[PDB]
Amino acid sequence: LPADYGKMPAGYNFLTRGKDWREYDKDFILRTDAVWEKFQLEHFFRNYMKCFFFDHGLKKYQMFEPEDMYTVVFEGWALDDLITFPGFTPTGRTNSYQIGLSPRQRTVVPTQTFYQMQDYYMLCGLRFERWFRCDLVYHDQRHTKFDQVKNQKNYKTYPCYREYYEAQYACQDDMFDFLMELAYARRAADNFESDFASHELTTLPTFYDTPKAAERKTYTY
Amino acid sequence: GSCLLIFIQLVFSGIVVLLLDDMLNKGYGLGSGISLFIATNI
Amino acid sequence: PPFTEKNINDWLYKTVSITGRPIHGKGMMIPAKSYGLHGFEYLVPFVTKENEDGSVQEGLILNLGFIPREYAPIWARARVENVEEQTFTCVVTDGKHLSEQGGLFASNKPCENQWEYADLDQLAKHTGFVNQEQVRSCILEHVNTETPNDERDCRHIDICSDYKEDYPYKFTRSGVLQQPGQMYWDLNKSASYYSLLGL
Amino acid sequence: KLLKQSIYDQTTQYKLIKKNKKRGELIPVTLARRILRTKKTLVLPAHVNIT
Amino acid sequence: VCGIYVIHVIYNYMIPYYWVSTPLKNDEFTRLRMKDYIASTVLEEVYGISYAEWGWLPHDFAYNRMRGLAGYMHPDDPRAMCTSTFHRKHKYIEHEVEKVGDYHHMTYPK
Amino acid sequence: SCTTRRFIDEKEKLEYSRGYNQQELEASKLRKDFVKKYIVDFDTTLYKTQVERDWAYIAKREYRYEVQLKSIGYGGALANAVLLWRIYANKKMVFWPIPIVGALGYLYFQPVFFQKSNKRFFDMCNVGEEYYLGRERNKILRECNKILNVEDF
Amino acid sequence: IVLTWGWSSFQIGGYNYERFDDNGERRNTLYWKLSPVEFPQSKLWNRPS
Amino acid sequence: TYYSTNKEALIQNFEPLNRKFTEEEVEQFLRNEGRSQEEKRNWIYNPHIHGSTEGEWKADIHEKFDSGKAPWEREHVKAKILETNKAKIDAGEEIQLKPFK
Amino acid sequence: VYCTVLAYYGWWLYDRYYLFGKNATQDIRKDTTEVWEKRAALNKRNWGYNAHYKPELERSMKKVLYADPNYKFPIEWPERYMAETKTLEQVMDEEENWEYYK
Amino acid sequence: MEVKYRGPSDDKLECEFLENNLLSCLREKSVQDNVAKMTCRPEFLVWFFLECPTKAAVYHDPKGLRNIFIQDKIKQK
Amino acid sequence: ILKVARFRVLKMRPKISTSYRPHGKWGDFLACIIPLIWCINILTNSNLIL
Amino acid sequence: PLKFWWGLNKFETIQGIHSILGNAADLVVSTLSFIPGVQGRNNASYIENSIRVTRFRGFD
Amino acid sequence: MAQTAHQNRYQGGLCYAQCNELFSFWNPSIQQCWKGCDFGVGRVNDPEGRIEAQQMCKRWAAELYWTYKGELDTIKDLRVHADMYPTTPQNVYRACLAGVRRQKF
Amino acid sequence: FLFYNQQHKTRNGYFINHDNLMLASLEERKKLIFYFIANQVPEKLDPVDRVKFNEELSDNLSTKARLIGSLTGLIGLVGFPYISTRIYSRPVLNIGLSLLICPFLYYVGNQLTYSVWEPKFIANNNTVCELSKKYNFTVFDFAQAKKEAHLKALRTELV
Amino acid sequence: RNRYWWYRSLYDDYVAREAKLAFGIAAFIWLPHYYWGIHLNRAFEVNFSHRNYAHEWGPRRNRLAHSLEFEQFDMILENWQDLEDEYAQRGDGML
Amino acid sequence: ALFFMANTAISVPSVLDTSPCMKQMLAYEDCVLDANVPQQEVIHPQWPTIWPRLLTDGKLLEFDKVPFHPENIYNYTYMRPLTKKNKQYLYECEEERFVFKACLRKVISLKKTDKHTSWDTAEVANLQLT
């Protein structure tokens, strides 16, 4: 083997034109039913990825939204909202892949604070309160230092994006609208919660309430 | 012990014999139970 | 069509390819069994010529093939049947074993769709076609001519094992040749059995 | 599975299905939908998790 | 038995509900996690998978194994902890999995 | 599927009813010899690969239900007929017709049900050319194709 | 009435349904290895529930 | 179940050596007295008794002894096996390289 | 004796739960180093890390390339599931200035 | 999945559409897509071999393909 | 049922029930084993689907 | 089944019986060695003696 | 321990006990620590096996959460504390590494 | 014992071990090793050599032993009726007596003809000497063949 | 066990004769149920096997068909390019 | 519970995959995944001919796309030509690509003829009965 084995030769076009394919016959095995199975392949594809129908008036492929059997059969003459078929992929490649769960995202306000309850209402309130604190810090700087800048040169992600998306996930739009009304009522008056909070004076002491908070944690490899 | 020496007399090593010796002991014991089961039936 | 009561022996059991429009509304279901399935032979009035009003029609009887018992009623199907002009390649057939399958203590009830055997005159009357003699002459069995012509093929309807075809299932060229239960090997076996019983 | 050009009157077909459609005793729920019909479908993927 | 069950419920579900009722300055998430953990995570869950063969056939067990590995993917879940592993073969017979830890993806059993 | 199984059963019944030619008989003999040896006369759990063991056991179970159990049932029916005849003749209970006539019925019906379903068992061994069982089945299949002047799967 | 009918009728019904009606399969399907199985009868009709 | 599993493993995965040990394999066996157990042997190169060069000799020694690679895993030994037993290669008998253990 | 057996079982469960560290420490000292090393070797699994292509084809070039101890993959396995943190222009520039080993 | 069976359509208009797409793709890819505007849709190529077996067999046949190429060249001038 | 339908009516061998009160040996224990098994079954199944 | 007298070989009495029969047959052959075609018994060959005396050696 | 190798934490051995001792009882990081114990079974004693196990921890953290290419390579402090929760890929990586460190044999 | 079959222990050179080889000459050692390998592990030989050795062994030891055992069993069947009278016949008893006598005499005759002719066949056969020179097995080959023979006997006992 | 203990355990009432006669009949009434349940369990297992295959190898076969069609196009394209080369040689004599 | 189902059908095996060139397809896909190429069109072995612009400029669409605007790196992946590193690590997967293409061409060369008498009962040979 030459010392350059595996190195792509200069000007390699990846072209198989005029190539002898009779040398690879010993590198694969086809069973006796390969001819039959091939047809089956085609059959399945022709009846599985064909969610579109050719139209003679337009002479092109069209489609509609998923419909029940009764509507497809006994209302085939009365079809509404026909859209020209655009293709599964823009470049014509295959898209038939088995999918899975994508990696999760970082959590600022954990769901485990209120996870015994299937209904997320206290969690919704907590997440919205945290986002509202962050927003009260940054709400008026958004159009000059953050997402709403005129030019992309000074573009920066809004610091409360993750908390906002967590609050949106935890709350329905109705409860989110209620909390946004409260947020407007408290941002018009610039009511930071620290201006009124005193309940820490009437709360039981805890090991986490030590004056030396940085030295309470023991770090270990 | 005795089977170990017997199987080492045949071309074998001490480690390999133990694996082979166990199988014969298990097989002979199974036959003894089969003989014991046959005696109870008849 | 050239088929007639007098010329039928010229066209009997002969492959034609005729264009016309089938009437799935008035289809007759002759009881039959195919590969252990109790289903029906699906006869339809095949309209070849008709006037614009549609009151006067003439045609033939077309055996569309075997249709299972579950899907015999029109409301049981997930399709709206096509009754426009279609071309069907069919073997002209007398329709003999269908007319001799009722057995004793069996009779057809027309004026309703109740059939036990293919009584040609009653089927012709049910069709309502004007050319009664030609309709009574024969029936055209929907066949697939891309199949072996031997009677030993043992695939009588054009299907696969998985039944991936669509009902009704048309006949193969061996299916048309096949008389159910009266082939020469069956009669030879019966003759041998009765000779053994007698001697 | 072809969007052909209809030679019938589609309104007449719709009104004839509305007026008098053939039914039977053992008719599947697929072919007999009278209270379970909507104008939109909620489409979701299969073999995956949706909250 | 009913009294023991009721006392167990009130011990970890009713009374701990009153521990935190106001926003907390220090380690609020820690305290809320403590309260929730002593309630959300129960012992029975582990058995619910430790004897999964009592109703899951081999192939259904394989499919539910991949499904459970997907559904308990999130790390911040104390209920996933104290739950018997899905990285296991079916006790009766295993078809898909040849070895416990021979995968091509970390978070997928194949 | 149930439809596939019923079609296979009824087609086998029709083939046995019409007859079995001569070259068809030779091919059937080759297929039956291969199936008998490699499935009935061999422990299907002794194959090297898991695919071979699984599908050979599936073929053996099919043989057990379609040949062994069917032949046992038909031989038992024949033995029951002879037993009823002998009970009526002797006007008392007898036991001899059960073992002897049952064995004779099994020996009469096992070849019949094996000849009827030889192709079914032969095809179920088509695990592939990568395995020993598949290679042997493919060799026998090529011989049968030479005999019958056709191509099978 | 009490024993024989309540312990054999449904099994007979399912066996006849599979033997004759092919378990009510819609036969116009492509690939058995890729198709759902039409199960035999499993809900007993001879029990009150 | 240990007995059943071991019996299945033995029956499935046991074949006779099916070949005569080659000259190279026998020579390696006779030189296996040079193998040291629990402590690696210090291989010293003497050109008048070993020949070749120091690098090539040390590479061959590492292949033969230190690497643990068996004689039947050497390419030239495999070629000799497939050449000297071609009569058994014919008639559809496959030669087994590593003896069963 | 039924009450005594039930009490013993309950105490065993309590001790197993509460003295897990002590029990595991005692169990780790019941076998010598060699036995534990053998057990650890038997339980060694890849768990899906670095599960790159394993060439089964005999003429595959990547077979010889992987046998080479100096072969560099285009990206490290743990980095195959991490989002890129540099601009597309930088990525294309680095890839176009990239040079193959050997 | 319960996928029903329907054989290749061989519809005149559908196969004309698919064959026009195939000819466009052949003309585009024969010059490594050096055209000013490329109208080829690769996905429809797949369907040409799933629903037009007659035209696919014609295209595979060397004489039929030669005739098709000659006619296309005449059309393109 | 057979007994009470065939041999417990007055004209078919009735019994002189002379027992004032019942004296049982772990009665409910035998009457609660069958239900408890059911409970187990149900619980297990639910957990799996949950 | 039929083959268990072979398993009876472990007893030293059976081995002695076999040795007596074999030696008597060897004497018969040696006295008949004058007839052409019979090899006879040679007492100067190691192989013959080793096969004779070690046949039942190490029996288990 | 749905993501780990053992049905119960007691089969993990001394490594799982040390993982339990590392974090508070309500901290889900323990499970991640357990995965470290799984990655360094036959690898901790081998000098390159330890690096392989650390790479396995990095891959595991990258698969659980969305991560950036340099993110796990610029962690200033790899030490863990009792109240460290697996809310970030950095925390998952740190817990997994701590579990790897505590795998004797 | 009754549990296992031990007809192969004292036949076809199964009893050859290293003690038979330590005292043998180089040529005698080669002959003994080849005989043991050919009888116990025929796979080590080419198929033509296997056929030749089987033919040379059958007409001298195997088939001759079968015939001698058959003759000695026929010696034990001078009268097949054995116990038999006009009043009563004993078919099952006579069959049992035959199955107890004839196998025993067969075993005795077979062991005798192996005890007499096997050493002479090993030491005075031209085919054995020629094939031993052709193959020229070593002590390592004999050790491997001994292991293979024991493992094959174990496998046969298992099945 | 203890006959007296087991003959009055059920609330001092005696149903032991019917309990004894119950085993013999109950030993056979469960056979049809058991065999049909075996059939149903096998059907469920086959359906789960089909679900696994369709989930895993379902998408893969569609890609294989896609590649088969692309390869047919590739063969046609090679022949078309050969024709283009011939037409480049014979500028207009080919037509 | 313990034996509530009273039986488990362990005899029925996993559905055997009998696709013509599935093994070669999976080998080629694994090899291409090793190359770590952003373009997905490389999944098909015919990419040099179907999308030749992958080797010249990467313009695979004539501005008839809907992947959103080029604001992040994960945009216009098919509109990105193969770099030198991608080309090298794809060339390393050339033999498996060739074997896959040869298998596809041989399968295409297979035609249904009149000697396939077992076509109507090909399911049994395909091993669909368990």
Ligand SMILES: CCCCCCCCCCCCCCCCCC(=O)OC[C@H](COP(=O)([O-])OCC[N+](C)(C)C)OC(=O)CCCCCCCCCCCCCCCCC
């Ligand atoms: C929880 C408890 C439930 C049951 C409690 C009791 C209440 C219900 C009592 C029902 C009583 C029986 C009613 C049905 C009677 C007919 C049986 C039937 O059709 O079953 C359907 C079953 C099933 O029929 P099938 O095969 O059509 O199944 C249905 C199939 N599908 C669903 C697919 C459409 O049929 C049989 O079982 C037929 C065989 C048995 C026939 C028995 C006839 C002989 C009767 C002897 C009586 C006793 C001896 C008398 C001697 C006299 C001497 C002088």
